[PDB]
Amino acid sequence: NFLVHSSNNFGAILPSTNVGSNTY
Amino acid sequence: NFLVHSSNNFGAILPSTNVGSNTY
Amino acid sequence: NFLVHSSNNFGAILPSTNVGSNTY
Amino acid sequence: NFLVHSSNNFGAILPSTNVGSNTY
Amino acid sequence: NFLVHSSNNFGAILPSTNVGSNTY
Amino acid sequence: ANFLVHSSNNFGAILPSTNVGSNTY
Amino acid sequence: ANFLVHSSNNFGAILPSTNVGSNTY
Amino acid sequence: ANFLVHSSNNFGAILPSTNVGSNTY
Amino acid sequence: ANFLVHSSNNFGAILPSTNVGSNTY
Amino acid sequence: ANFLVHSSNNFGAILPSTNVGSNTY
Amino acid sequence: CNTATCATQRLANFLVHSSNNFGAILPSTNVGSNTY
Amino acid sequence: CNTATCATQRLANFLVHSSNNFGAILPSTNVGSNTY
Amino acid sequence: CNTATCATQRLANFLVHSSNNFGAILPSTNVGSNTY
Amino acid sequence: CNTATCATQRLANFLVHSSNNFGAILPSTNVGSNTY
Amino acid sequence: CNTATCATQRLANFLVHSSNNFGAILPSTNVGSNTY
């Protein structure tokens, strides 16, 4: 369904799903 | 369905889906 | 369903799902 | 269902799911 | 269901699930 | 000299790559 | 000289890669 | 000289990779 | 010289990799 | 010189890898 | 290295000091894949 | 390196100091793929 | 290294001092995969 | 190393001092996989 | 090392002093896997 594929990415990754009110 | 493919990207990635009111 | 694949990523990874009100 | 695969990632990993009000 | 696979990761790992109000 | 950040949220890559002069070779 | 951070949240990679001059070789 | 951090939360990689000048070889 | 941290929470990797000059070889 | 930490919580890896100059070989 | 595929390199009196770069330093390959 | 495909390099008295660049430093390849 | 595929390298009087880089230092491969 | 695939390296009078890098130092492989 | 696959290395008068790196120091492999 949901596929996250990161290759040598610079920075954080945010694949969070269906979470209630994320605050960063 | 949803496919995220990042190759040597510079910056954060935001694939978050169906989350309620994301605040960054 | 939900697949997280990170290759030599620089930064934290946030695959948290269905959590209530994450605060970082 | 939920699959976390991290290869030589630099930083902490946050796969926490269904937790109530995580505070870091 | 929930699968955590970390290969030579640098940093702590947080797979905690259904815990009440984690404070770190 | 002093520097800080109060409530910033940097979602990416910062590449200063600073180096001190070395006169190599 | 002094530096700090109070409530910052850095979600990424910082690459200063500083080095002192060494005059190698 | 003094430095600290009070309530910071660094979610990533910091790569200063500092080194002192060594004049090797 | 003095340094400390009061309430910081470092969730990652810090790579200073400092070394003293050695003049090897 | 003196250094300490009061209430810090380091959730990761710190890699100073310091070494004293040795002039080997 | 004859009659068959081969790769070789020779270096002497060498120095390299490069800033942050997303690749190997002076790499060489005949047919292989550099997917690091 | 004859009668078959080959790649080779020779260097001496070399110095390189390049700013942040998205590729290898002085790479060479005959047929291979640089997908780093 | 003849009549069959081979890889070889020779180095002497060498020095390398590179800043943070996302790859091996002076690597060489004939057919293999560098997936580190 | 003839009539069959082989890998070899020879080094003398060598020094290496590299900053933090995400790969082996002067590695060589003919066919193998570097997945460290 | 002939008529069969083989790997070999020879070194003398060697010194290595590398900063923190995520890989072996001067490793060599013909066909094996480096998954450390």
Chain N residues with CB inside 8 Å of O15's CB?
Answer: 14-15
Given an 8 Å threshold on Cβ–Cβ distance, is H8 in contact with I8?
A: yes
Q: Which two tokens stand for residue N26?
A: 């002067």
Distances (CA, A) of O19 to D13, F21, K18, N4, O14: 25, 20, 15, 37, 17
Q: How close, in Å, is residue L15 to chain M by CA atoms?
A: 10
Q: Which two tokens stand for residue F12?
A: 């990416």
Given an 8 Å threshold on Cβ–Cβ distance, is I24 in contact with H20?
A: no
Identify the burial level of A21 via C-beta atoms within 10 angstroms of its C-beta, where 0-12 means exposed, 13-18 middle and 19 or more buried: middle
Rounded distance between C-alpha atoms, residue E13 and residue E1, angstroms: 18
E strand or H helix that includes residue G20 = none
Which residues are CB-neighbours of L3 under 8 A, at least 6 positions away?
Answer: K2, K3
Q: Does I13 touch chain O (CB under 8 A)?
A: no
Residue D13's φ and ψ, nearest 5 degrees, are -115, 135
Rounded distance between C-alpha atoms, residue F6 and residue G8, angstroms: 6
Chain H residues with CB inside 8 Å of O17's CB?
Answer: 24
Count CB-CB contacts under 10 A for residue F8.
11
Q: Does M14 touch chain L (CB under 8 A)?
A: no
Count CB-CB contacts under 10 A for residue M11.
19
Q: In what order do the strands lie in the sheet with I9-10?
A: G9-10, H9-10, I9-10
Whether the Cβ atoms of residue N30 and residue K5 lie closer than 8 Å to each other = no
Rounded distance between C-alpha atoms, residue M21 and residue J10, angstroms: 26
Count CB-CB contacts under 10 A for residue I16.
19
Q: Does M22 touch chain L (CB under 8 A)?
A: yes
Secondary structure (DSSP) of B1-24: -EEEEEES-BS-B---BS-BS-B-
Task: Give the Cα-Cα-Cα angle N5, N11, N15 (nearest 5 degrees).
Answer: 140
- Name the residue among H15, H17, H24 with its Cβ closest to that of N17: H24
Chain I residues with CB inside 8 Å of J14's CB?
Answer: 14, 16
Rounded distance between C-alpha atoms, residue G18 and residue G25, angstroms: 20
Name beta bridge partners: O5.
none
Count CB-CB contacts under 10 A for residue I3.
15
DSSP state of A2: E
**β-pairing verdict for E2-7 and M33-34:** unpaired
Rounded distance between C-alpha atoms, residue N16 and residue O19, angstroms: 10
Given an 8 Å threshold on Cβ–Cβ distance, is K24 in contact with N23?
A: yes
Residue F15's φ and ψ, nearest 5 degrees, are -120, 60
E strand or H helix that includes residue L10 = strand L6-14
Q: By C-alpha distance, which of O11, N21, K24, K23 is closest to M14?
A: O11
Rounded distance between C-alpha atoms, residue K6 and residue J19, angstroms: 41
Chain O residues with CB inside 8 Å of I16's CB?
Answer: none
Task: Give the neighbours of chain O: at least 3 Cβ pairs within 8 Å.
Answer: H, I, J, M, N
Given an 8 Å threshold on Cβ–Cβ distance, is O19 in contact with J17?
A: yes
Method: cryo-EM
Identify the burial level of A14 via C-beta atoms within 10 angstroms of its C-beta, where 0-12 means exposed, 13-18 middle and 19 or more buried: buried
Given an 8 Å threshold on Cβ–Cβ distance, is J17 in contact with O17?
A: no
* Resolution of the solved structure (Å): 4.1
Q: Does F25 touch chain K (CB under 8 A)?
A: yes
Q: Which two tokens stand for residue C3?
A: 């697949």
DSSP state of E13: B
Q: Which two tokens stand for residue D9?
A: 């990632």
Chain I residues with CB inside 8 Å of N17's CB?
Answer: 24
Q: In what order do the strands lie in the sheet with K33-34?
A: L33-34, K33-34, M33-34, N33-34, O33-34
Whether the Cβ atoms of residue K27 and residue M30 lie closer than 8 Å to each other = no
